[PDB]
User: What shape does this take?
Amino acid sequence: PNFSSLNLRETNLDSLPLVDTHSKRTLLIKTVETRDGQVINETSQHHDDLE
Amino acid sequence: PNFSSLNLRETNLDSLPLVDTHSKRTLLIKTVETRDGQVINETSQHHDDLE
Amino acid sequence: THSKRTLLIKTVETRDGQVINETSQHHDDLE
Amino acid sequence: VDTHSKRTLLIKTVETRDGQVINETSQHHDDLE
Amino acid sequence: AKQESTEYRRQVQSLTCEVDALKGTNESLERQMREMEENFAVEAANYQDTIG
Amino acid sequence: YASSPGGVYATRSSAVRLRSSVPGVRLLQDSVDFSLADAINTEFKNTRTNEK
Amino acid sequence: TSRSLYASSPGGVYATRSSAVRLRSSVPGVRLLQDSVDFSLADAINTEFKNTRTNEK
Assistant: This one.
């Protein structure tokens, strides 16, 4: 009876790294470059950071 | 084997790629209403809609 | 017999509750 | 015959809502099973 | 803006009191969550006192 | 005579699923424990170890 | 004098066709993969976690 080899596993306690809370920090730097008031560029830098 | 004991659970595997559930999804609708090349209105409507 | 020495650890991994980790680890031990 | 290992039913919600805490539970039952 | 102010003072005071009523609702909803913490606790433990 | 109906109707419903063009369905994927199944796998090891 | 419920499909049940309004949602399809697409080797093994009990008995 050397059981705990089963042990009906241990498909595990699963503190695994499957996280996004770990938050998905959507730093949306919407750089609206206007000239005179007209939009010339919108450099929308989505830094899509997973903390 | 005496088959068991069991750890099958999602200790940080749940806490999934779920962000809240919400990507901190800061939808900044910066409506730059320009006329004749000049800004006439700059309505920066934030939504923080869940994702 | 070697009866049901079930160490039930309720490992609730609190990064909140509906997200989701009610790990009721039934260590059914046979002592 | 042997049993009663301590069925520690440490029930714990929270429930962060909208990015704010709206309750913080941390209950501690031990069931003598 | 003088005409507007006659509704705007009511809109401000209604949206203040509707926020303030949601704020007295949210403290009282956390009181429903405390009374749920006691309910899940008496469900878990007092049921096993009856098993005891 | 045990005529007893061991089969209970595990009641399914599916009323007609309208235009779910409301996008507010957050994902959650929370599973499975089920540590009672690994307790039952340990009770099958224990029942074999009694049978041994 | 035993006789019991020898009837299939309790309540008359089968998977009747549902088909709704033609909603064209895009769905980006974040899969739960299912490593239990018949983990079945495990349920033949649930029968062998019990054939192992049958031989010992």
User: Anything to note?
Assistant: Residues 16 and 23 of chain A are 16 Å apart (CA to CA). The longest strand of chain A covers residues 38-50. The two ends of chain A are 47 Å apart (CA to CA). The beta strands of chain A are 24-35, 38-50.
